[PDB]
Amino acid sequence: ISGSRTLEQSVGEWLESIGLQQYESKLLLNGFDDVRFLGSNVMEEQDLREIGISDPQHRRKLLQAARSLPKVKPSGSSGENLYFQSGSSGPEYPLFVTVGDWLDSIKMGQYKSNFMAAGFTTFDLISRMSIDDIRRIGVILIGHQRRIVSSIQTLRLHMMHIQEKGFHV
Structure with missing residues (x-):
């Protein structure tokens, strides 16, 4: 703009x-x-x-x-983005093409090395992680753990929906 x-x-x-x-x-x-x-x-x-x-x-x-705070849709990355959108004018939900870009969208980029060191680099790996799993790779602050797990849940919902639709399975 x-x-x-x-x-x-x-x-x-x-x-x-x-x-x-x-x-x-x-x-x-x-x-x-x-x-x-x-x-x-x-x-x-x-x-x-x-x-x-x-x-x-x-x-x-x-x-x-x-x-009562507004739900702010996550920003896409400055590099490549993958988006799901419902309707011609509906909100774009980013799916990301790298773990780093996903972490950056929630201001959690400082933990990229934690995920990489654990080998947790694919969506499939990350999608089932609990708060305990996140704490265990070194995300110590509760507000960061909760943020990450909430993001995972919403991303997983979108990915499951796409899979269920039956084209990109």
Whole structure:
């Protein structure tokens, strides 16, 4: 586009908007560090307890607020992209052509070497990974683990759908 793009808030600015900024360091230090990757499949009550949000009313408030954030479709890569789209004008869902490009789409590129060192370089390998499997290759921060597993789930849904349609199996 020729015109400007509006930028997303920081986690701190978002928390201030909902009266919960005292939890900023706990979120950031545990990988809840980008407002594009917070909310229902990603942020869970038990995780909030574990990182030290002991106040149950604040946990409920935070979880509801995270659910109110827009779901931002992942950006394609600057190199090659593979997209699924429903309808002539529907949203493009990227499927990626490399593990690195997939990780970059969720700002998790720092973990490419972790996946490579484990030999987890194909979709088929990665698609069945649990949170525990992800932690075990060295993704320690809970907010990053949750982000990755949520992304895997949505990518797997799209890939299964395509397979079920019966042409690219």
